[PDB]
Amino acid sequence: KPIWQRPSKEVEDDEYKAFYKSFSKESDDPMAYIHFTAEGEVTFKSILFVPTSAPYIKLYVRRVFITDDFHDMMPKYLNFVKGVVDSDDLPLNVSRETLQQHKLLKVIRKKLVRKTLDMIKKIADEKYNDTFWKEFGTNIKLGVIEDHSNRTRLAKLLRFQSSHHPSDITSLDQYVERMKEKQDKIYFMAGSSRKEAESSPFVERLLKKGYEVIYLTEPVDEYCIQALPEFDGKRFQNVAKEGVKFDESEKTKESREAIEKEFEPLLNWMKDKALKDKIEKAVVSQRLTESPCALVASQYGWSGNMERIMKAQAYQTGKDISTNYYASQKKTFEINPRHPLIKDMLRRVKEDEDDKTVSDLAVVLFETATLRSGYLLPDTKAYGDRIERMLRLSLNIDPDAKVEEEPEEEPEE
Amino acid sequence: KPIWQRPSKEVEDDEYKAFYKSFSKESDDPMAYIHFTAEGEVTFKSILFVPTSAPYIKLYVRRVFITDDFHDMMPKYLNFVKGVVDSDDLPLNVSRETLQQHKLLKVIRKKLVRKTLDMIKKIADEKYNDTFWKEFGTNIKLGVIEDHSNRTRLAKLLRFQSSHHPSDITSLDQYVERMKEKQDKIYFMAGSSRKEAESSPFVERLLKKGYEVIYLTEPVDEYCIQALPEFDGKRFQNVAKEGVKFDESEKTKESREAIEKEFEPLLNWMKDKALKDKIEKAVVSQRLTESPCALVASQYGWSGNMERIMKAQAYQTGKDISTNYYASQKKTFEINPRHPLIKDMLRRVKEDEDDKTVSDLAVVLFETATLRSGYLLPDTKAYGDRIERMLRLSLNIDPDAKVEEEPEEEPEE
Secondary structure, X not given: OOHHHOOXXXXXXXXXXXXXXXXXXXXXXXXEEEEEEEOOXXXXXXXXXXXXXXXXXXXXXXXXXXXXXXXXXXXXXXXXXXEEEEEOOOOOOOOHHHHHOOHHHHHHHHHHHHHHHHHHHOOOOHHHHHHHHHHHHHHHHHHHHHOHHHHHHHHOOOEXXXXXXXXXXXXXXXXXXXXXXXXXXXXXXXXXXXXXXXXXXXXXXXXXXXXXXXXXXXXXXXXXXXXXXEEOOEEEEEOOEOOOOOOOOHHHHHXXXXXXXXXXXXXXXXXXXXXXXXXXXEEEOXXXXXXXXXXXXXXXXXXXXXHHHHHHHXXXXXXXXXXXXXXXXXXXXXXXXXXXXXXXXXXXXXXXXXXXXXXXXXXXXXXXXXXXXXXXXXXXXXXHHHHHHHHOOOOOOOOOOOOXXXXXXXXXX | OOOOOOOHHXXXXXXXXXXXXXXXXXXXXXXXXXXXXXXXXXXXXXXXXXXXXXXXXXXXXXXXXXEOOOOOOXXXXXXXXXXXXXXXXXXXXXXXXXXXXXXXXXXXHHHHHHHHHHHHHOOOOHHHHHHHHHHHHHHHHHHHXXXXXXXXXXXXXXXXXXXXXXXXXXXXXXXXXXXOOOOOEEEEEXXXXXXXXXHOHHHHHHHHHOOOOEEEOOOOHHHHHHOOOEEOOEEEEEOOEOOOOOOOOHHHHHHHHHHHXXXXXXXXXXXXXXXXXXXXXXXXXXXXXXXXEEEEEOOOOOOHHHHHHHHHHHHHOOOOOOOOOOOOXXXXXXXXXXXXXXXXXXXXXXXXXXXXXXXXXXXXXXXXXXXXXXXXXXXXXXXXXXXXXXXXXXXXXXXXXXXXXXXXXXXXX
């Protein structure tokens, strides 16, 4: 009597563990397993396993070994799941092309997934984060993207890093638990490493104000969170895009609105002259603590991280998505109203609006902010020359009429 | 009597063009074809085609159709070659697992390739660059890397852009032809785009001096040129690495050597203090015209371009090659001996060696040169802050004792 045909309650814990090693060697235990029998439209018995490493599903029709080459048994992201499936409904006396393309095949596929996820839902707690996540956490994320129907089920299985603790991973449910009263957004920051994301300008105020930010350090991470509309009735919000709010009070609103009136000629100065055709608009930032300014993308446009991931993949694989869409779109330049540099810029503009010193500074500041916002710098040659021109003021060396002078004394050599 | 069994001289040009469309539709002509019979160790007849786009090799044993599922017939880079193969030596009646792993199979494969390249060698001249190159140029570059034995045959087929002309591609032979008398290196610069490679500081003097520099703007490009040791007795030289020479004369040598004695206390100053543990050594640059300084990688180290490509692929796929080797190696910092800023630096160091103003400037200059050299900036948060510190000097705003003040007047909000 095959291991999978006996009742669930009659099989020893040891026998399952012995069964797993029989078709994979390695001589070590699986992370988990479930033995179930399916009822309803399609009847079949099965045992599915979760190995302990990534570094294969046995099909049986009416108890007769058919194959295990069927790679479309599990969806892309569950290709690590090993086990047996013993149907008694499928056409036994047919071809392998016919059988793989049958009506009941797509049905069994879905039932296997829904059970696999039930198994994973029950992996202890301390063991989940310490084992399963560091091994197949990527698959869970891939699933959120691909498996639309089990999306909310998978959402719970997600684990990320957050501003709550320097290293520890957190679940989405845990985040929601820590949230502030009026807060209704799950704030997150995407990047190349935790150190980059936490250093970023976009999280500054949210942190100081006491909010929690999730750090996405993986390449797939932003796509994942992107394919997840809501979670427990809370919508997601990329701190590097437009969408951050701070409810406050009436007297607080009065102040901020009055600050925006004050800086208005400076914001129009950047929009119309200093950075014309460089930014979409200039506004007073609400997310900045100590940074002078940052570049913020539109709600459905590309973040700094997105632009990199896209360009990288389009360069390695694609055919130059240069004039793509929201790839070459201007960003919203946000400035910190309480920054010494921004305040001088306001005053000096209301005085001499055609002051090239401010104009050329605004550019250097913008381009530095371009790098700090995570976006690629268009022309590193020009930027380096603008730093050079300004560097030479900090010394004395005649800006224009010297970078020619000695650099062209070379005809002697 | 099949199309491939008749003599080469007896088959009409039209009939070949007709034969191509019969197994691929599309209703349009191929770019080139060759009909040949093989003599020697293994005998077979074959017609190979080069399609006009990229967006399949018919195997016959003793005129009997066998299959077209054999994807290991051509090497990876020639997967675009469509055609027929009619052997009479192969085991006719044997399994497909057997026949694919046979002795003579590896032999036929090499003959097919050597003939494919003979076909491509004969693609007119005007038609080669305008059509074939912009379609399969990449495969040629992959071949140089993969196909060792046909490497010198493939090298000639390579086409790149160069400083000789704004857009026109050039062959390697053409480059050799334009070379100077004492020149014995093929100078090239690797980048993300042409505009980037030509803007680079590394090409400055070589260009002024009259030398020609090849620009590599594709990801695979530097990997290609790297796997090619010599070409027509000329070794290659990456303008961004150590290796550039300028033969000159004795009185020229006297001057340069006398200059290296002059800047020595500034070179030791950078190495031992201002940039201690940042650079490997500071030297007097011979490749610079108008740039103040640049980072130069070792001979077989990673160039700026290399670093970017390696890091990207190691992020999209690999597991953080952070503690690799020549991934985290310090570069050689080269200064232009005739730059107003460098000259002030030398003078200001011989006087006050512990002048923090110079010490702090040399870092901003080094970091700007880090970006200009095509290298990744380690901590953009720090860099932005250093620019900010210096920006506020060009206004007045108390550097240390202000970036605290107003940026911490927020507790009122």
